[PDB]
Amino acid sequence: VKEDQTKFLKIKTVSSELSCREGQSYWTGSFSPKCLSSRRCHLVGECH
């Protein structure tokens, strides 16, 4: 009714972006090795 109601619904367009659709993935980091050594003479244990 004139001078009444007049309800406004607005659709603001904030932004348009070109998003990414990820495929495969994996993880990685920084690694360092540690070694334990044992020296045995021949015919000792499995020194064959």
Binding site: L36, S37, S38
Partner: protein, 48 residues
């Protein structure tokens, strides 16, 4: 002259020698001209 020492790694090596602890000396039971020089019903060894 120390206490227990815990280690992060076990790096150990063995070197051979000719000290008495490196030799396994044995003898037979019932062996002629040896200790326990009597008839045996079983073939067994003896420490020396």
């Amino acid at each position: 002259n120390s206490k227990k020492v815990y280690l992060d790694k076990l790096d150990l090596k063995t070197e051979e020698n000719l000290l008495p602890d490196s030799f396994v000396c044995f003898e037979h039971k019932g062996q002629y001209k040896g200790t326990m020089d009597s008839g045996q019903t079983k073939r067994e060894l003896k420490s020396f």
